[PDB]
Each structure stands twice: as C-alpha cells, then as structure tokens.
Amino acid sequence: VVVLSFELLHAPATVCGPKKSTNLVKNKCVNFNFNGLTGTGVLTKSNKKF
Amino acid sequence: AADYYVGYLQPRTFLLKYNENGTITDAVDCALDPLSETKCTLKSFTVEKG
Ligand SMILES: *[C@@H]1O[C@H](CO)[C@@H](O)[C@H](O)[C@H]1NC(C)=O
Numbered sequence: 001v002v003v004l005s006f007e008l009l010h011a012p013a014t015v016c017g018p019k020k021s022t023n024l025v026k027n028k029c030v031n032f033n034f035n036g037l038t039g040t041g042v043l044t045k046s047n048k049k050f
Numbered sequence: 051a052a053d054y055y056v057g058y059l060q061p062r063t064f065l066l067k068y069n070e071n072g073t074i075t076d077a078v079d080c081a082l083d084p085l086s087e088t089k090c091t092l093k094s095f096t097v098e099k100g
Contacts, residue, residue: 049071 065090
C-alpha cells in the first residue's frame with residue numbers, strides 16, 4: 001500500500017508539471033501560467049520595490 | 051556573565067499597517083484595551099468623537 005499527501009494554493013514550490021517553458025511578451029492581451037498562477041491580462045514592466 | 055530576554059507567544063489579532071514601499075510601520079493589538087478594539091472595528095488609526 002502506497003499513500004501520498006498533497007497541498008495546493010501555497011507559496012510557489014517544486015514538484016511541478018513537466019510542461020515546457022516559453023518566452024515573454026509585453027503590452028499584449030495574452031494568457032499566462034506563472035508557476036500555478038493562472039489568468040489573462042497585459043504584462044508590463046513594474047516599478048514596485050519588492 | 052551575559053544578558054538575554056525571553057517572552058512567549060499567544061494567539062491574537064493584529065492590525066498591521068503597510069507604507070507606500072511595502073514595509074510594516076505600525077500595528078495595534080485588538081484585545082489590549084477598549085480604545086484598541088474601536089480602532090480594529092473602524093479599521094482606522096484615527097477615531098472621531100462619538
Ligand atoms: C520609498 O522608497 C523610495 C525609493 O527607494 C524613497 O525615495 C522613499 O523615501 C521611500 N519612502 C519611505 C521610506 O517612506
């Protein structure tokens with residue numbers, strides 16, 4: 001018998017999918033899949049001091 | 051000899067305040083005195099007469 005525990009919607013961590021990466025496009029209506037975070041919008045250069 | 055201080059933690063509710071650069075500047079405990087409970091309900095640091 002094999003058991004396994006999962007956890008979702010947390011800090012971006014490892015143990016993820018095998019999908020290939022792509023490039024970045026800005027100022028264009030596009031879909032994104034940034035390490036689990038999913039949505040659509042327009043990506044632009046920010047200036048927030050993280 | 052040396053010197054060191056020790057405290058202990060408890061489950062509480064705080065009202066953290068972020069500045070325009072994303073750094074915590076002030077906080078208010080919500081179970082310290084009657085005045086502090088008013089601030090948490092109003093979600094403001096300034097209370098008008100009433
Ligand atoms: C926020 O950061 C900018 C640039 O680092 C600085 O000019 C400004 O004074 C900061 N504001 C603060 C510390 O309240």
